[PDB]
Ligand binder design. Structure first.
Ligand SMILES: OC[C@H]1O[C@H](O)[C@@H](O)[C@@H](O)[C@@H]1O
Ligand SMILES: OC[C@H]1O[C@H](O)[C@@H](O)[C@@H](O)[C@@H]1O
Ligand SMILES: OC[C@H]1O[C@H](O)[C@@H](O)[C@@H](O)[C@@H]1O
Ligand SMILES: OC[C@H]1O[C@H](O)[C@@H](O)[C@@H](O)[C@@H]1O
Ligand SMILES: OC[C@H]1O[C@H](O)[C@@H](O)[C@@H](O)[C@@H]1O
Ligand SMILES: OC[C@H]1O[C@H](O)[C@@H](O)[C@@H](O)[C@@H]1O
Ligand SMILES: OC[C@H]1O[C@H](O)[C@@H](O)[C@@H](O)[C@@H]1O
Lengths: 140, 140, 134, 140, 140, 140, 140
């Protein structure tokens, strides 16, 4: 692999997903969460040179945030909130970029992971009603 | 295209508008918003070498701000506040320039996007009584 | 010359003063408005004035021969019946002034070497535009 | 030796561990702590080019944090909070790194050590129910 | 003329003073003010290579500040608070230097000038009971 | 000498101590203090290339902090709290290193010394139940 | 002279003192003050290559602070608080060095001088019960 796989965090629940393109980096990512469940529920990704929107999980959240990533822009700082355990859930995401851009999504009330950094390339995990589990993917 | 199209955020309502000029960059942009609705209602854009004011939406807000951009000034930080959904609306905007100029219009109470950065070339979206949706447009 | 947007109303008497070595703003707490502006140019002892100096406050910014505006905010009320309400300026040498009120509308202007001002004034400063060198 | 052994702090209790790979550095670290006991309880570590999770302690706390360390990333700031004496215990860890990443696990109510700095290579200590005692280990 | 004369601010009152020495700079300047009147009352100046004190005004204030200037240190920040009009007065002075030294004397409740900057050469104005009027003078 | 002796501060009481090793710098130092007396009570030092722990004063405090010092790490900031007088006492110690590490032991309610700075080489003073007196020793 | 005499501030009272040594710089200075009188009472100075303490004033204060000055360390910021007048007194001293060291002694309620800066070489003034009057001395 020409990739780094960050630890998938959260539960074993929902349907597996893996978004990646052969010579392709993420150009846009969207987080949808609720104040009712304090969870992530829905994620969309767009890729470079590809108009196609790749979605997973049920967009039942009252908030969304999108981060748009320039062609030369990397993730230097990355934090996923989650609930640990087999019945676990991904609850939150902060990201910060080589250009001072940041996004903050959902809640960080239990467990965290400060992931690897670099050019964000894909995401992997499991999602149904909620984002059960999420790991980021980078280049080397 | 030599253009970067940021995600149009907000609703599908209102009349579509596209402001862009062959070989031209925005030299002035105005945002008009109300405390009453917590929405953007009206945008004006001037372009380099062109005394024409392209306007959209009903200018019924009690506040407006204008950002004038020098020929060599770029947007380095960009956040649009909006209400997601078909029945959506663009609620606020926050720009910061390569010269430390910044403006802030409206409210950021629901969803946000941190857009692409670069030399702002124009805008597109939909507007009637309100700015239903707004996407920014940069040079490569 | 770069001409920044004149912001405020259509009222009062047109003025055009045209490097600025000195600019003074006069405003009041009663009306929360700019009433009067005075300007001196380099190599000229003449004081150019507009608007009625009725206000209880004034500030002066003196500008060194090599000192530019890098930060510029004019506060105003919008519309035909508009007024200029305030001015913040910040220079390339870290100097800054703060005049009047910023309670409704703002413009962040073009930056550079301040060369003049245009607008209209009577009792008040109805409308103000900064002018810079290219 | 090609290594630096930071002082093991805390008590004499629990079962000995020593996790270190010759010619290998710690790529991931997880701290599991409780709000009930105000203690670290469990630690997992993964080395580079090795999916095997080397774990010690009982994972019975309500919180966990995970730091993923990039191949060229070093620890520039390191604080373990502990209770001193024979019946002593490890109670917290704050790690700050050469890229600005930071994790804060546990509580710092009694005693602190600001360790040696560099490339985190391994951990040594004793653990049962609780992390009784922890010492970081770096390269030279 | 090798000199910049900053605008004299304040009133027409008091006895004229003008303190300056050809090829001489201010090595020290003292401001005396009162909480009673909220006015500057007295000013003193020493010049480089000269023990003599050039004074103006009635030293009746409950406070004074002295700023000593090294031979190569200039003024980069200078603000005089004053009451405008013919019956006007000087109320305050903030000065900051090229070495990060600063003094603050009296009050700033009505009018300010942010003056010219550079090597402080002398002072000019009128003073009796109070400082009616003050303009600074710098080298080119 | 090739050493810098910081002022010993505190009282004349206790048993004199000197902890220095020819060709060796302190690689570790531990402060033990109490909330009961608001004094430093006990101090331990380890030296580069030496596993021997040098100790003085009675370890009766409820808090201890340890600072580990990389071989190339100096002290850039040093404050000792103490009571003045013959019957005086050393009450706390704050050290900041050339790598941004810092510690804070005991109390600063009475007198303080901002010491000399450099590579910390030893310590000296007197101790019994308390640290009566502490002086730091640096290389030139 | 190869010396800069900062203004002596405070009163005419007390016994004159002058601390200076020919090719010498202040290596240690102590300031004794009281919360009772809000005055400096006592001052001690040690010089480079000289174990002798030069003292002035009456040590009646409940507070003291000591600054040690490395041989290549200068004063870059200096403030003396004082009561002006014939019956004036020196009330306080703030010093900041070329290495980020700083000390605060006594009180700043009335008058201040921001002195000349450079390598502190002595002090001059008068003292009895109190420090009546204090002026610093630098090298050129
Ligand atoms: O995402 C939460 C939840 O979503 C659905 O309810 C199912 O897919 C579950 O298996 C899953 O755990
Ligand atoms: O701007 C909000 C709203 O304004 C008008 O009522 C119409 O143009 C709608 O389409 C639009 O959605
Ligand atoms: O300045 C406000 C107001 O003042 C004067 O009355 C006139 O010059 C008007 O034209 C103007 O609108
Ligand atoms: O880890 C805390 C505690 O847990 C277990 O009971 C044993 O390992 C003890 O030796 C240990 O002290
Ligand atoms: O300073 C206020 C007042 O002081 C003195 O009385 C005189 O010099 C007046 O001319 C002056 O106006
Ligand atoms: O250390 C504080 C105090 O403790 C012991 O009682 C003795 O050694 C005393 O001399 C000492 O002053
Ligand atoms: O120092 C304060 C005070 O102490 C003594 O009384 C004498 O030295 C006085 O002249 C002096 O003013």
């Amino acid at each position: 692999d020409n990739y780094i796989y960050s630890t998938e965090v959260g539960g074993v629940g929902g349907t597996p997903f893996t978004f990646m393109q052969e010579s392709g980096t993420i150009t846009s990512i969207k987080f949808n969460w609720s104040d009712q469940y304090k969870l992530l529920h829905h994620i969309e990704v767009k890729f470079i040179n590809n108009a196609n929107i790749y979605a997973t999980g049920d967009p039942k959240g009252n908030h969304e945030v999108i981060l748009e990533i320039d062609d030369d822009e990397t993730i230097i700082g990355s934090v996923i909130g989650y609930k640990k355990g087999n019945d676990g859930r991904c609850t939150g995401v902060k990201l910060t970029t080589s250009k001072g851009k940041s996004i903050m999504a959902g809640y960080f009330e239990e467990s965290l992971i400060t992931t690897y950094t670099g050019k964000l390339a894909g995401i992997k995990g499991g999602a149904g009603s909620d984002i059960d589990r999420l790991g980021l993917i980078f280049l080397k």
